[PDB]
Amino acid sequence: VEYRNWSKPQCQITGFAPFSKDNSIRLSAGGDIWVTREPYVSCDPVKCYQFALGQGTTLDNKHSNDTVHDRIPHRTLLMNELGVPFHLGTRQVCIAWSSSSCHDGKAWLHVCITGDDKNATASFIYDGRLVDSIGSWSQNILRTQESECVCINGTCTVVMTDGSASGRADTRILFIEEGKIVHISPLAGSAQHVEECSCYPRYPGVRCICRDNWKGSNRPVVDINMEDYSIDSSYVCSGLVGDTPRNDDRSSNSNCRDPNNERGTQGVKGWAFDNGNDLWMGRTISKDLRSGYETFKVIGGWSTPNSKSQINRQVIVDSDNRSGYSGIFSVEGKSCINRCFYVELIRGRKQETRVWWTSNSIVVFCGTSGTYGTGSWPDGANINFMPI
Amino acid sequence: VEYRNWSKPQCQITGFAPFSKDNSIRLSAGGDIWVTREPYVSCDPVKCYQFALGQGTTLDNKHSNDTVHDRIPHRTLLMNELGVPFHLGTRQVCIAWSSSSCHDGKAWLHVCITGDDKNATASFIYDGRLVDSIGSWSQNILRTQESECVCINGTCTVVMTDGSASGRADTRILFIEEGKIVHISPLAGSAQHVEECSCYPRYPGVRCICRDNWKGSNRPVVDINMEDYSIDSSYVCSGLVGDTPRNDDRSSNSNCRDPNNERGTQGVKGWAFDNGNDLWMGRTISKDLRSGYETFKVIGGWSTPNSKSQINRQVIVDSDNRSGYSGIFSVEGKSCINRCFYVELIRGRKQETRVWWTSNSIVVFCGTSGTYGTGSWPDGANINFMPI
Amino acid sequence: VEYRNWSKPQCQITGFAPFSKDNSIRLSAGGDIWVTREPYVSCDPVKCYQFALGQGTTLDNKHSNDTVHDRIPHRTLLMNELGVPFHLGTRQVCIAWSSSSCHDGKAWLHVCITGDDKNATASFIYDGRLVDSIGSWSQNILRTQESECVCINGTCTVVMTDGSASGRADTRILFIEEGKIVHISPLAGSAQHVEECSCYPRYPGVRCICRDNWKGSNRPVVDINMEDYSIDSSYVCSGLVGDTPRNDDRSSNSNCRDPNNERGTQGVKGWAFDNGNDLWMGRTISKDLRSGYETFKVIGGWSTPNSKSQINRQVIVDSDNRSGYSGIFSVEGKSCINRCFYVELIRGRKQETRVWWTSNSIVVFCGTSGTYGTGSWPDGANINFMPI
Amino acid sequence: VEYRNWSKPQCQITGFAPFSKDNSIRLSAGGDIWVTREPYVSCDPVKCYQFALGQGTTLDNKHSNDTVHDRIPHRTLLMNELGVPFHLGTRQVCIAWSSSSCHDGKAWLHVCITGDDKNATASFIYDGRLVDSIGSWSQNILRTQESECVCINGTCTVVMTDGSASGRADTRILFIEEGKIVHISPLAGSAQHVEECSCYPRYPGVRCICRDNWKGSNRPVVDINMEDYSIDSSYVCSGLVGDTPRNDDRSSNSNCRDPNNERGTQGVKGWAFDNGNDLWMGRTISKDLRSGYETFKVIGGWSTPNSKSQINRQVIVDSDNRSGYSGIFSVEGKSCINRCFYVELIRGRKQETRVWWTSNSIVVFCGTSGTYGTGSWPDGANINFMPI
Ligand SMILES: *[C@@H]1O[C@H](CO[C@H]2O[C@@H](C)[C@@H](O)[C@@H](O)[C@@H]2O)[C@@H](O[C@@H]2O[C@H](CO)[C@@H](O[C@@H]3O[C@H](CO)[C@@H](O)[C@H](O[C@H]4O[C@H](CO)[C@@H](O[C@@H]5O[C@H](CO)[C@@H](O[C@H]6O[C@H](CO)[C@H](OS(=O)(=O)O)[C@H](O)[C@H]6NC(C)=O)[C@H](O)[C@H]5NC(C)=O)[C@H](O)[C@@H]4O)[C@@H]3O)[C@H](O)[C@H]2NC(C)=O)[C@H](O)[C@H]1NC(C)=O
Ligand SMILES: *[C@@H]1O[C@H](CO)[C@@H](O[C@@H]2O[C@H](CO)[C@@H](O[C@@H]3O[C@H](CO[C@H]4O[C@H](CO)[C@@H](O)[C@H](O)[C@@H]4O)[C@@H](O)[C@H](O[C@H]4O[C@H](CO)[C@@H](O)[C@H](O)[C@@H]4O[C@H]4O[C@H](CO)[C@@H](O)[C@H](O)[C@@H]4O)[C@@H]3O)[C@H](O)[C@H]2NC(C)=O)[C@H](O)[C@H]1NC(C)=O
Ligand SMILES: *[C@@H]1O[C@H](CO)[C@@H](O[C@@H]2O[C@H](CO)[C@@H](O[C@@H]3O[C@H](CO[C@H]4O[C@H](CO)[C@@H](O)[C@H](O)[C@@H]4O)[C@@H](O)[C@H](O[C@H]4O[C@H](CO)[C@@H](O)[C@H](O)[C@@H]4O[C@H]4O[C@H](CO)[C@@H](O)[C@H](O)[C@@H]4O)[C@@H]3O)[C@H](O)[C@H]2NC(C)=O)[C@H](O)[C@H]1NC(C)=O
Ligand SMILES: *[C@@H]1O[C@H](CO)[C@@H](O[C@@H]2O[C@H](CO)[C@@H](O[C@@H]3O[C@H](CO[C@H]4O[C@H](CO)[C@@H](O)[C@H](O)[C@@H]4O)[C@@H](O)[C@H](O[C@H]4O[C@H](CO)[C@@H](O)[C@H](O)[C@@H]4O[C@H]4O[C@H](CO)[C@@H](O)[C@H](O)[C@@H]4O)[C@@H]3O)[C@H](O)[C@H]2NC(C)=O)[C@H](O)[C@H]1NC(C)=O
Ligand SMILES: *[C@@H]1O[C@H](CO)[C@@H](O[C@@H]2O[C@H](CO)[C@@H](O[C@@H]3O[C@H](CO[C@H]4O[C@H](CO)[C@@H](O)[C@H](O)[C@@H]4O)[C@@H](O)[C@H](O[C@H]4O[C@H](CO)[C@@H](O)[C@H](O)[C@@H]4O[C@H]4O[C@H](CO)[C@@H](O)[C@H](O)[C@@H]4O)[C@@H]3O)[C@H](O)[C@H]2NC(C)=O)[C@H](O)[C@H]1NC(C)=O
Ligand SMILES: *[C@@H]1O[C@H](CO)[C@@H](O[C@@H]2O[C@H](CO)[C@@H](O)[C@H](O)[C@H]2NC(C)=O)[C@H](O)[C@H]1NC(C)=O
Ligand SMILES: [Ca+2]
Ligand SMILES: [Ca+2]
Ligand SMILES: [Ca+2]
Ligand SMILES: [Ca+2]
Questions:
Q1: How far is Cα C321 from Cα A150, in angstroms, rounded to an integer?
Q2: How far, in Å, CA of B367 to CA of B365, rounded?
Q3: Helix (H), strand (E) at residue D25
Q4: DSSP letter at C258?
Q5: Domain that residue B3 falls in
Q6: With an 8 Å Cβ cutoff, are A372 and B121 in contact?
Q7: Terminal CA-CA length for chain C
Q8: Of the residues C70, C170, C223, C318, which is catalytic?
Q9: Which GO terms label this protein's molecular function in UniProt (chains A, B, C, D)?
Q10: Domain with C312 in it: what CATH number?
């Protein structure tokens, strides 16, 4: 086997094609399916896997009541082949209420985080063995990506932060070889607050579009130099803006340098990737709630301050349906490396009240250079048929 | 590994031997089994798999109500080893309310179709990656085979149509190498309307017996020249006739050239294959409803206009039991390549009314050059023990 | 890979050691477990598998009612690793209400029989493909081994019979290479009626201890010469006698040549194997019912007419618990080839009446040349906790 | 493949990092999960597996009532990948109410014990085949490790005892090559009573910290010389003491040579391992009940009589939650061999009375040379949501 070095042009894409949907909540009304959240899909050199943070219970289980809480000792990283849902024969790969997994070519690395908020611990499991660990540097919820990490020539890099949610925080980018933390680099550049990076290889670097939870609606950008371990950060140029809350397109801005300060506080995990000076990105259709999901290209979206010229829009989940987190993943193709994304469709509390649980299903699309039509692929569960 | 080129004589067969039955509906009254329809089985060079379009739910689930509808965003192509039923650990290979899968020797290709009726999109997933896609050319339900596609020396060919159901439509035959559409050829020859082809290798070509939904009871024939990408189409000569509705054998005809216009409209997916000037084929025993299933050889059935000389008949499902779609699949043997078939036994609505769901189970037989006896192998579920 | 030629001395054994138990009926009162009967375990060169004829349903299913019947179109041969029970993800390898499976070194062969009693059909599935078939020669329930077949240098041999149950019948021994019936040899020698052979390699031959359903309580012996395809048959010498009904040891006899005519009619599948002039064998503890199971060596049991000198007795299931069929299986060891056996513990109707189903679990032991103690390992299900 | 010879320095560790948790009891209130006890995890050269003694039933099954009993004929050794829980597709590897499993590099060895108390039998299954067996030498419950055995260069060694619980007993250490008992060595040295050894490679020897059930609260030490088959035994020096009941740290002692006679009788399976003259160990937080679990280093804990200097303490399960058995397991690292441990969290009777079953879940941690924080990871099931 050899290590992945991702040195292939990004594929030219026209938009996104349907790829998978696991239908976990519809199935949960007639099956023993895990309660999850924060899903992501990462993919080894032969096949893809879907991951999620389980709540240590199944939906038709009395223990599903009050699973809105993001951190309990019973959360484990579930790992399955993309498309097979989280049934009882699913493997719990590690204890984690925050994770990132990636494969370096030769084996999988999982960074799982559990523990006390104020004194959490992160374990670096590589190829089955626990090879390293690190404790909470700012005593306030050590967290990471919640989507795939990326590895070039042996080194994987994950970005993690500990600190305030909506306040300044301490973000560091760890570089790790075979499970072992070989370097830690603090965040440098313009970004004010990094939460949940959606990173992707951009040989010879890695680039991430993260979430700004303090002062923005525009999304942070974190650039990692795998050779010097140098970090750089910015905001995505596009005036169209990916976070939720967001202003609305008439009143929204980004100057590529600072948090725009328009409905800053909070976010939702999202992604975007550059294509020359253009930007492919996705966001909720709502600017207040995480409902609906749409994708489009923004001409000049990457390189020009405030560019709002959209084209190739696609609705992935209509505005009357719920979405959640979203992240990117890259698959090596024969000729180029493509970009794909998943979108979490959360259901349950607090928004839907009939039931007392909170869980999600996923839908995933991949870039295509061919043609496509139209559609909307929501979760599909009728809330009145669910248990609880 | 090397690519399949299927250059081996067709095996001489005497009739059909029992091969598999998964018992999905009997099992569904005491287990969490997927609701499906449009099953097919395709087979890689070491083993066989059964496929079906799931309705994103299990039978003992309130979401199974009203699964008669053929297209919803929650349908996925399920794939399992032949004989293991669609339980909750089954993989959903792609989003699809229409499909065709085949293996070129080196990996699997799946063509999955989802989307809006009027603007559907087809993704070409090969070896795990999404390698291509195509949008609806006639804005009216892009559809394909619903059974195995076939590949010779690297190129796979699927036939798809977009257009009217019972009216003229636009049928094209796509040739694809490693997931990539490398050529599209429109339907040429005598056939008036192609729906659901049951194709099979006939080195160096591929031959399909499809469904004519507009003007026939006799079945279309589509011949693909893998070297020039030339298409040709006809109708099966046999006066015995494979579609349902059908006239009855006294009053039925086929001249090998045109839709016979005897109870044309509608169909059911079926198959047939040639053997010299003879024809092996199967059909429902009923000519009105898709009930019972029988197979037989028709002497001169392939080459002579209206030949109705039957021999070697076998009942696979008695006339008092339901059948559904049927299709062919080919398995490479040591000496020759054999032909086998599956027959979908649908249950539920609209025909059976106690329950509110619609689903199927399968039974599959393979050609044999040996001896065999008699039997009838229906679905078996007692409708009064089923949920709903 | 290479073919198995089984040329290694039989291991010297002292008695039997516990090996597996799957606990299917206890589990069925809290799980979706298949209803089965006629189990057997066969073993490929790296691991072992347990097989059973399923009744196309699970126990907590209304379709389990009246599963006492031995032949319905919904019976399939289930195959799993020894120890993993028949849950819903179990593969149905073929349609069969009678079977025998074995592995020639290079792949598995399964002979599955389904159909009409009076006109059944047997398919020879080898390595996934259906390679041959044969119809019922005497129009009265074609049947076979119900335990492992054995293959030496490529040729597998199964013994099958068609004819009267308790009356004369037509027994033939088929020799098959890669799924293909290459020779059929009729039964020759002293045996009057062969039903359910428990065969085992005895290089260069194969030897079977079968069931005599017409005139005996002593067990038939069938000897196959793999080189000339010559058959020979006898009765086991031992005056202790393996069938049920049986007389009792005071009044029982066998002269090694003829059916003893002591409580002839009927039987139960059993086994025995020779060791020099001695005989290792097992039988129900009851002589009327198939309850309890015991094993022992009979000094001179193989070579001397009526020898009743027992030693090394072991109780495998106490007399207050039910047993059923039993059969042998051989595993290649480093030095010698060992013999092991399974014993079906049937539960349900007609003997236990609370419930309306009939099913079994298995327990299996293997020969040992070491020491052992004592015990009794019954099914274990409390009939009052079962569904139905 | 080659045999494991474990010749690598023990890794220097700082404490323990979270590794796995399977959540079996929370899941059992909405899933068909096996009732177990005496879990352990052993690990082959590529991945790890969790093992447990099943009670031949699932929790939501009426057969789970009264599973407090440690020995019934229906107990089997369940084996799964670490993290996938004991669902119905889990393999029952052998009949056993006591076990130890290990992998020699080339294949797995399982020593399973079943039978009558007074006349039990142990089978040595290696690589699938039953290769040997041994009967009860003292006619009073033959038992073994209940955790991993260890193999160096081909020879595996398990320690087993037969005799009184709280009284003198007969302990022997068997050395076995490929399933075959090649030598048996009786216990020699200072230890008075050995029960449940937690052994680990310490090239070229093997070292075990066991349970003294007669006269101690300090833990026995058993040293095996793989070259001469010589045994030696002692007590762990530390005055801090690992058994439960225990005195309390003010009043507790160990002189490294004799049972301390402070609350001797009974125990609980535990572990400890040396590091120079220090000792890493774990124990219940309670000294009366097996509740809570803590680990720490004891400076001079290995080499100095009665050393009570603790440091690096970690709470793994808080004192208000239940624990149970605990044992060690070793994983080969790139550079050194690490030590990890699991802790059984038993639930049910006799301590919790609402329910009538007894079962456990596991949590496992591995040594780390990095940093870590704090936490408590209990079972998590709310006893009021459980069946029964
Ligand atoms: C499979 O699927 C199908 C279809 O699926 C769609 O189904 C629903 C449920 C969706 O949510 C999807 O998920 C799905 O896609 C199902 O089939 C349907 O099932 C329904 C039952 O669940 C059945 O019945 C419907 O159900 C609807 C909701 O469930 C109702 O909206 C509908 O009725 C509505 O209008 C009624 C108007 O009259 C109203 O009734 C009130 O009742 C009283 C009756 O007495 C009215 O008046 C009487 O009132 C007083 C006393 O109370 C006086 O009496 S008296 O005379 O003095 O004595 C009045 O004078 C007297 N009225 C007179 C004389 O006129 C009262 O006034 C009404 N109230 C009002 C405000 O008007 C009711 O409240 C509703 O508003 C009806 O119940 C569907 O028909 C059925 N569909 C089909 C095709 O069959 C399947 O069930 C599922 N399930 C399964 C297992 O498969
Ligand atoms: C079958 O399926 C296909 C594929 O999915 C689908 O085609 C796609 O249609 C969408 C929706 O119309 C297209 O996306 C739009 O693209 C335009 C820009 O392209 C046009 O204009 C440029 C020049 O500017 C030309 O070069 C080009 O040829 C086109 O003529 C965008 O403007 C669209 O964005 C606006 O509309 C969105 C909704 O569609 C809004 O949500 C968004 O906020 C934008 O609105 C704002 O700007 C408008 C003016 O710019 C203004 O009027 C508004 O009020 C507001 O201020 C959108 O990106 C997509 O490109 C097509 N993709 C491809 C590959 O063709 C078919 O439509 C579908 N058919 C059916 C029947 O379903
Ligand atoms: C045990 O199992 C075996 C194997 O399954 C089974 O054998 C098979 O039996 C079937 C049913 O009879 C055979 O199929 C029939 O074949 C005849 C033609 O063969 C005969 O005639 C030719 C000359 O024409 C001879 O060379 C040959 O030797 C035979 O004598 C067909 O005519 C049959 O079709 C008609 O009958 C069907 C029902 O059987 C109708 O549904 C069908 O529509 C046809 O009817 C029409 O034509 C008839 C005149 O041609 C007319 O009388 C009717 O009214 C109507 O117009 C059918 O194909 C099959 O070949 C056998 N297969 C083999 C390999 O032997 C055993 O029967 C079975 N035994 C038991 C006890 O179950
Ligand atoms: C712990 O576990 C071990 C291993 O399982 C167990 O040892 C085994 O015990 C059984 C039961 O006793 C032994 O099997 C018996 O063997 C005798 C023959 O051996 C003796 O005699 C010969 C000479 O004849 C000596 O060479 C030899 O040393 C022995 O002394 C058989 O006769 C036994 O069969 C009779 O008894 C059965 C019940 O035990 C009956 O069901 C059976 O029908 C036979 O009865 C008939 O014959 C009797 C006279 O022959 C007559 O008295 C009766 O009325 C009737 O007509 C049986 O095979 C077995 O060999 C032992 N195995 C080994 C390897 O040692 C321990 O017993 C067990 N301990 C505890 C406490 O549980
Ligand atoms: C975030 O997470 C980290 C990592 O888990 C955690 O750090 C760890 O904290 C624990 C708990 O305090 C530390 O363990 C203690 O270590 C001391 C010894 O170390 C000190 O003293 C030596 C000199 O003796 C110095 O060299 C060294 O620098 C330290 O200053 C032990 O004494 C502790 O044991 C006693 O306390 C236990 C409870 O903590 C008792 O249960 C135990 O029985 C011992 O008590 C007895 O002795 C006491 C005097 O010796 C006496 O006062 C008592 O009454 C009684 O007689 C314990 O082992 C551990 O080493 C830290 N690990 C590392 C790597 O740093 C952080 O605390 C955590 N932060 C938050 C906010 O959660
Ligand atoms: C079809 O594929 C087969 C399988 O590879 C080809 O067989 C090879 O061709 C010649 C002799 O037939 C030699 O190159 C090899 O020895 C053959 N393969 C094997 C596995 O023996 C065959 O030529 C192909 N035929 C066509 C018409 O394409
Ligand atoms: Ca924000
Ligand atoms: Ca028609
Ligand atoms: Ca008899
Ligand atoms: Ca003690």
A1: 60
A2: 7
A3: helix D24-27
A4: S
A5: 1-388
A6: yes
A7: 48
A8: C70
A9: exo-alpha-sialidase activity; metal ion binding
A10: 2.120.10.10
**What distance in Å separates the CA atoms of residue A369 and residue D37, rounded to the nearest whole number?**
55
Residue D147: which of D106, D101, D185, D186 has the closest Cα? D101
D70 is catalytic: yes
Q: How far apart are CA D155 and CA B92, in angstroms?
A: 46
Distance in angstroms (rounded) separating the CA atoms of residues C94 and B23:
11
Q: What is the Cα gyration radius of chain A?
A: 19
Measured CA to CA, the distance from residue D89 to residue B48 in angstroms comes to 22
In the residue annotation, B325 being an active-site residue is answered as: yes
**Cis link prior to B204 (omega < 30° from 0)?**
yes
Cβ distance D88 to C371 less than 8 Å, yes or no, reads no
Nearest residue on chain C to B33, alpha-carbon basis: C88
User: What is the distance in A from the centroid of ligand 10 to the CA of D296?
Assistant: 20
CB contact at 8 A, B100 and B108: no
Nearest-5° Cα angle at D240, D236 to D242: 65
Which chains are within 8 Å of C by 3+ CB pairs?
B, D
Q: Which of C89, C244, C181 is nearest to D89 (CA)?
A: C89
Please name which of C184, C193, C192 lies closest in space to residue C157, comparing C-alpha atoms: C184
Token readout for B345 is: 């036994």
**Residue holding tokens 């669609």?**
B86
| Structural domain total, chain C | 1
Q: Are D220 and D271 in contact (CB under 8 A)?
A: no
- B294 marked among binding-site residues: no
d(CA D211, CA B77): 55
| Angle, vertex CA B96, rays to CA B94 and CA B102, nearest 5 | 70
CA distance C382 to D56: 12
Nearest CA to A344 out of A282, A301, A296, A287 is that of: A282
- Please choose, from the candidates D28, D26, D49, D166, the residue with its C-alpha nearest in 3D space to the C-alpha of residue D99: D49
What is the token pair recorded at C213? 């359903």
B227 lines ligand 6 (CB under 6 A): no
Ligand 4 pocket test target in D113, D119, D137, D139 with most atoms within 8 Å of CB: D119
For residue C336, what are the CA distances in angstroms to C12, C202, C331? 9, 12, 9
Contact B23 C94 (CB under 8 A): no
User: H or E segment at C24?
Assistant: helix C24-27
Query: Concatenated DSSP letters for B221-274?
Result: EEEEETTT--EEEEE---SS---SS---STT----SSS---SS-S------EEE
DSSP state of D10: B
φ, ψ (nearest 5 deg) of residue A27: -60, -40
Bin B372: left if φ > 0, else alpha if -120 < ψ < 50, else beta.
beta
Cα(C53)–Cα(B27) distance, integer angstroms:
15
Chosen for mutation from A11, A13, A14, A20 (greatest number of chain B CBs closer than 10 Å) is A20
The answer to whether the CB of C138 falls within 8 A of the CB of C169 is yes
Of B324, B249, B239, which is closest to residue B289 (Cα–Cα)?
B324
First vs last Cα of chain D: how many Å apart? 48
Place of tokens 């020969």: C367
Report the C-alpha gap between D22 and A142 in whole angstroms.
Answer: 23
Whether D83 contacts A93, CB under 8 Å: yes
CA gap C385, D60 in Å, rounded: 12
Rounded to whole angstroms, the Cα distance separating D152 from D132 reads 20
* CB–CB contacts below 8 A, A to B: 148
